[PDB]
Amino acid sequence: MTITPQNLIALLPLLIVGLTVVVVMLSIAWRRNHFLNATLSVIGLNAALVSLWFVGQAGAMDVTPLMRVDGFAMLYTGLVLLASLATCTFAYPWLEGYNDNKDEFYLLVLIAALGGILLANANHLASLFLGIELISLPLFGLVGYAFRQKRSLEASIKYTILSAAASSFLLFGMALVYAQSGDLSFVALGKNEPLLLAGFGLMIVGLGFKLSLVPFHLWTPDVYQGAPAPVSTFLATASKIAIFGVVMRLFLYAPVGDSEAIRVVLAIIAFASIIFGNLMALSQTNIKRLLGYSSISHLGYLLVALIALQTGEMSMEAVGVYLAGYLFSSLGAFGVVSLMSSPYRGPDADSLFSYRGLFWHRPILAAVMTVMMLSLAGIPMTLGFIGKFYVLAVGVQAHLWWLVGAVVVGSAIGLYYYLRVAVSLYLHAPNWQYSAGGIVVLISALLVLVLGVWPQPLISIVRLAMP
Amino acid sequence: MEFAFYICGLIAILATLRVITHTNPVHALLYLIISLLAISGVFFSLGAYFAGALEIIVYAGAIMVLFVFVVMMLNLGGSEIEQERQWLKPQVWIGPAILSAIMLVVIVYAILGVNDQGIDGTPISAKAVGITLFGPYVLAVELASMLLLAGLVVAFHVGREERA
Amino acid sequence: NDMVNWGRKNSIWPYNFGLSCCYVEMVTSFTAVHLRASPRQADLMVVAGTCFTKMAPVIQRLYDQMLEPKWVISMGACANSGGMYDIYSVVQGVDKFIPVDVYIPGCPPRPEAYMQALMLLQESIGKEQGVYRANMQSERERKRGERIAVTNLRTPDEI
Amino acid sequence: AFAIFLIVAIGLCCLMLVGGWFLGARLRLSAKFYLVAMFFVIFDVEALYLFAWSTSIRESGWVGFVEAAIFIFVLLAGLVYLVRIGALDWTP
Amino acid sequence: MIPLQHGLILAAILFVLGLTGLVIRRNLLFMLIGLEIMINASALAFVVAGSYWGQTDGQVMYILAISLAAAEASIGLALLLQLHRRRQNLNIDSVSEMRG
Amino acid sequence: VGWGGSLQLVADMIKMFFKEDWIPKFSDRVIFTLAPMIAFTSLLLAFAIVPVSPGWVVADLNIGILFFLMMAGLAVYAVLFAGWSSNNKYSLLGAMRASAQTLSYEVFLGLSLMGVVAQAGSFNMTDIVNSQAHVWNVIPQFFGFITFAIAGVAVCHRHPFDQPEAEQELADGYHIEYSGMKFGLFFVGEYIGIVTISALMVTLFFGGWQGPLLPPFIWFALKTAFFMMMFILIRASLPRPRYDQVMSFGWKICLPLTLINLLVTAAVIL
Numbered sequence A: 001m002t003i004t005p006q007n008l009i010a011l012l013p014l015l016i017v018g019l020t021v022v023v024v025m026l027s028i029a030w031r032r033n034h035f036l037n038a039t040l041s042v043i044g045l046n047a048a049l050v051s052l053w054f055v056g057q058a059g060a061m062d063v064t065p066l067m068r069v070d071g072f073a074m075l076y077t078g079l080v081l082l083a084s085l086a087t088c089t090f091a092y093p094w095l096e097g098y099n100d101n102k103d104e105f106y107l108l109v110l111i112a113a114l115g116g117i118l119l120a121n122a123n124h125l126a127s128l129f130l131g132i133e134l135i136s137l138p139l140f141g142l143v144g145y146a147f148r149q150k151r152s153l154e155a156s157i158k159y160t161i162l163s164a165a166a167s168s169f170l171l172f173g174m175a176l177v178y179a180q181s182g183d184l185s186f187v188a189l190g191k192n193e194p195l196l197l198a199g200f201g202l203m204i205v206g207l208g209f210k211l212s213l214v215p216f217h218l219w220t221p222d223v224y225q226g227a228p229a230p231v232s233t234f235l236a237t238a239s240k241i242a243i244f245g246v247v248m249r250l251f252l253y254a255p256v257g258d259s260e261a262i263r264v265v266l267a268i269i270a271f272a273s274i275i276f277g278n279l280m281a282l283s284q285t286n287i288k289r290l291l292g293y294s295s296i297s298h299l300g301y302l303l304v305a306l307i308a309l310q311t312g313e314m315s316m317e318a319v320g321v322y323l324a325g326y327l328f329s330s331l332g333a334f335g336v337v338s339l340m341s342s343p344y345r346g347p348d349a350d351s352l353f354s355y356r357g358l359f360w361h362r363p364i365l366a367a368v369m370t371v372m373m374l375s376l377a378g379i380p381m382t383l384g385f386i387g388k389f390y391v392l393a394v395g396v397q398a399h400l401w402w403l404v405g406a407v408v409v410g411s412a413i414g415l416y417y418y419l420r421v422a423v424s425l426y427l428h429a430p431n432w433q434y435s436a437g438g439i440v441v442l443i444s445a446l447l448v449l450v451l452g453v454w455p456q457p458l459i460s461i462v463r464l465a466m467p
Numbered sequence B: 001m002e003f004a005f006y007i008c009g010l011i012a013i014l015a016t017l018r019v020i021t022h023t024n025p026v027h028a029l030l031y032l033i034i035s036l037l038a039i040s041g042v043f044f045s046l047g048a049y050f051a052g053a054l055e056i057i058v059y060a061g062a063i064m065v066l067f068v069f070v071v072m073m074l075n076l077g078g079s080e081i082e083q084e085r086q087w088l089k090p091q092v093w094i095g096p097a098i099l100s101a102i103m104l105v106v107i108v109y110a111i112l113g114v115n116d117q118g119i120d121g122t123p124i125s126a127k128a129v130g131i132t133l134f135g136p137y138v139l140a141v142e143l144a145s146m147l148l149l150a151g152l153v154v155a156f157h158v159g160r161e162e163r164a
Numbered sequence C: 001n002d003m004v005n006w007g008r009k010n011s012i013w014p015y016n017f018g019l020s021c022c023y024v025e026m027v028t029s030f031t032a033v034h035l036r037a038s039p040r041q042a043d044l045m046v047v048a049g050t051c052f053t054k055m056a057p058v059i060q061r062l063y064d065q066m067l068e069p070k071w072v073i074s075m076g077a078c079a080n081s082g083g084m085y086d087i088y089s090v091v092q093g094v095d096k097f098i099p100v101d102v103y104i105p106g107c108p109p110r111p112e113a114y115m116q117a118l119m120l121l122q123e124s125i126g127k128e129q130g131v132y133r134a135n136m137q138s139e140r141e142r143k144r145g146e147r148i149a150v151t152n153l154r155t156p157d158e159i
Numbered sequence D: 001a002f003a004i005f006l007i008v009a010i011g012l013c014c015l016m017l018v019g020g021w022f023l024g025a026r027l028r029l030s031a032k033f034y035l036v037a038m039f040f041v042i043f044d045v046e047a048l049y050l051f052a053w054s055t056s057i058r059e060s061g062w063v064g065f066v067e068a069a070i071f072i073f074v075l076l077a078g079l080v081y082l083v084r085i086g087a088l089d090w091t092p
Numbered sequence E: 001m002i003p004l005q006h007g008l009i010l011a012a013i014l015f016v017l018g019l020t021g022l023v024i025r026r027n028l029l030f031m032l033i034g035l036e037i038m039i040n041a042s043a044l045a046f047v048v049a050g051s052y053w054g055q056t057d058g059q060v061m062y063i064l065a066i067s068l069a070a071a072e073a074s075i076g077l078a079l080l081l082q083l084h085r086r087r088q089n090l091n092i093d094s095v096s097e098m099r100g
Numbered sequence F: 001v002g003w004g005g006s007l008q009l010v011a012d013m014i015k016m017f018f019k020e021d022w023i024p025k026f027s028d029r030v031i032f033t034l035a036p037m038i039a040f041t042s043l044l045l046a047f048a049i050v051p052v053s054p055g056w057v058v059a060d061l062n063i064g065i066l067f068f069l070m071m072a073g074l075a076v077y078a079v080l081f082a083g084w085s086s087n088n089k090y091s092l093l094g095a096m097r098a099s100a101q102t103l104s105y106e107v108f109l110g111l112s113l114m115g116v117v118a119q120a121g122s123f124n125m126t127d128i129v130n131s132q133a134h135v136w137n138v139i140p141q142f143f144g145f146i147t148f149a150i151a152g153v154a155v156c157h158r159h160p161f162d163q164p165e166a167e168q169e170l171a172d173g174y175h176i177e178y179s180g181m182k183f184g185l186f187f188v189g190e191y192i193g194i195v196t197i198s199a200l201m202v203t204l205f206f207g208g209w210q211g212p213l214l215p216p217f218i219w220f221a222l223k224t225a226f227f228m229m230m231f232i233l234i235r236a237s238l239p240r241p242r243y244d245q246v247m248s249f250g251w252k253i254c255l256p257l258t259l260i261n262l263l264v265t266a267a268v269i270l
């Protein structure tokens, strides 16, 4: 079909952000200024949030055969935009101390927002590929931003080779499915012969690298230690939040995901992700590796809901609310880590042994890390508990007894390291945009508390979005 | 047709084996160029007329030129030869060779289960990709241009020049 | 057939190694007869100037670089022999260390002498050993009856 | 045909080569800065979309020219960006 | 007259060989070489899948796949540039910190 | 005296024949032999796509343009394996800078050729030679024609004048370490290159096989001869441009020119 004004209003998120890249690139070539580039980039992402209202004026419809725009995609675009908003506000205080070329940062984050808001809208297997790679190239390059350290370059190179490897597995799987089926459109796929299933397993490999699943999780510690903390805010939250939407939509639409042959394999990956995350996560004394270890377990809880997407309609809202709660928890925690590095400081010295005290140093910021760190676990009065509660309900609904038991025993194992960091901020002690960065994490603390005690308004938004 | 496909596929296989067995890099670059030429021959034999000639102009005419530049400027020939051959023994080659061979035999067993339904070398001209690129796939082109801009800026950045 | 000999007569590549002096006449010749001459590509080397003891290894490396068929033209009295500089710093002729085929006396020789050197060198290239039992004829002997028959010359008080 | 001419060319190559045989560590600041050629490696891929475009443009029409103008405008913005930052300048 | 299975097993063999080259060697140049080999294997599999059904579905993402190959090879080569600019040793065991 | 211009080249080719070949020590041997034919066979097979006659067509294949671009891109490898086979950091860097400016100035020809192949709409050369039946595709595309001219004269045709010498010190021209028949191979390669670029220019931009009042094959031959003489006239008139000025007037000036050229042809064709 051609371009109609309905299609342009539907495409408005992918458009405002793209116009922002052009204006930011022209502004970089004009002046090369940090203040103007930060202002121009954050205005475009805020303009994308405003235009989410305008696409809500439009209904559930297609733009091209590549994309389908539903109300589900409206919420996922919003999650990615607040993470992009969150990462630029955490990057200005870290980059003020950087020695030179301080302006390429917002350009790459803007490209990654294009990639994230393109995996929200998906209907064809090719859009899946244009999105994964649009976000990886900034994540190829931003973990290597400030390569002057001996580990940022190390982290960039390890992530670079491995992410190209996953994309090559995804592309080879993407074709081996299309050999049987006449089209690669998600809906048109599956219209249980082994080549289609074999092609499907290859896409699971190429998707489970970025979702940090059990035999592909090896990158998640190292780059999270190596990357800058502003990059870790985006790498923990936005990428996997955007990626989880497209992998859920493929199994919802495709009739091959209805068959139990793929279901058993994904359940075992989810089982082992919880276990192989929450057991190796105990011994760590580094906060960045600690959050990277928890990421593997959080994506595992998302999978134990996704396996029962096909049994009961409550799994849609369950995945949605756990993603919202998981966004807020990780942004607050990673913002405090980045807010401790108020200058560039070369290599930031962050560790669990380095976080003795921190209440008599900065009391407000210690409270935010504690609230979010209790929210990661499953303690009530926090939004993580309501998200944990729906995934338990989904597993009970679909009679996945081993999987729901894994979440409980994984929660039982994983309570230990969250609580040490919560109490280690209470042992004996050994600029304007910085106040803005404090405001972002403090705003998130208020939100996770009020949506843990009072969780109904977030459910109303989620059922408003779900089709 | 059958003999041409068989001989160019075997040429590609031999070039792929050759590029993964030698030590000197320039032989590997030459053999990889030969393999790419064989793949373009496969593309022309199948009937993908806009693929065999599109691969050479770009994949074997620009990117491999970048590989040639970096392997030429490192001047790694004549230094660090002995320890790489010492470490790369046949014994450590067998190790992961069988592990990848399990993958190979699994995908061979997967592909032989379907029927043949053989297709002739149907020729596809550029006139129809000029429509398919312009049909549903226009935003793919736009976001691919943005992808290429992203690659340009991250390659300019992380390859930053300095005084040294 | 001897087509190869015609090939070598028809085309020759000159390597100009003229030194401080004596090369201005060689340039006068070259700009009338002819950036084409390149090292390790030429088969003819026109040694001119005073072969100094210090720079003789340069001439020996350039002689080594060229291919198997090597021709050398010595120009000037300073290159055929030591010339007027029979001194510790001048080698007494370039033929001491490289074989030479044609000798062009003078100080400096004229461009026409260079032209006649190319003519005698294509003539030598067209008779093939290299001597071939034809090069014993000498310009001392060939034009002898021409030169002896000269009787009168213009008086030197006129222009 | 093309195959006959290719066989003739490779036979001539074999004839000339056989006839010829019978006839008888640290660079420091030097080199580097090939990144103009890397800019070519990426820009040829950008222009490959125009390579595929040039075959079918009459049926493309007004939106085709519009989004081709957008594409080359993005390329022009990137080029002036690289010029103005100092990446594309005098190079060894 | 060749059906799809022969071309697909050829692409699978090149896929496996590229993966093995990515695994076994030490030089990052050689892992990038195997990466590009295995990208080409996936592209070949896609092209034979596209030309199996007899429509214009093989040339539509192959161009973008080789675009990805170009961009990835360029950024990887620039990373190798700056790595050798930092440290003269080109082994992966030099950059092998944060183990475990 | 010799009455023919070609007889000098004939004697030169005979001279390059029967010259002893020396082995270089501490050098690779396969690339020392292979670098000439990457420069020679490329522009030899660039001749395989000309419609010299409907009845004596050298190849009736569906696509000739992509083959030409594939040879254009391939040509760089000859300068690169020559640079590595030089085995002298001076000469190697000279061949690296020569291949640099080569890749830099080879960009333009494809985008300039998009205009003519878009107003032609086909890759089979019979369609192009039948397109120039009444109006040639040179009147509207002046900028594209001159851009393709610059690109065609920039591919190792000696117009840059950095091949056998180097404006920059610490490096040297890359035609020095080859002195046997391979040097004659270089010259014959650039000769087939210039004649094939001229033939492609006449048969793709102007109208081949028109025949107003005389048989059209000699009409094509005489027009090709006039463009040969004009190419030699401007090559001789063209002075050596230093490396800097070539880098200045490269990607800056002619990429926008060809982009607005594509815009103009796309706007006027519909």
Ligand code: SF4
Residues within 6 Å of the ligand: C021, C022, C023, C048, C049, C050, C075, C076, C077, C078, C079, C083, C106, C107, C108, C109
């Ligand atoms: S021959 Fe005469 S001009 Fe030549 S170097 Fe000797 S003295 Fe000078």
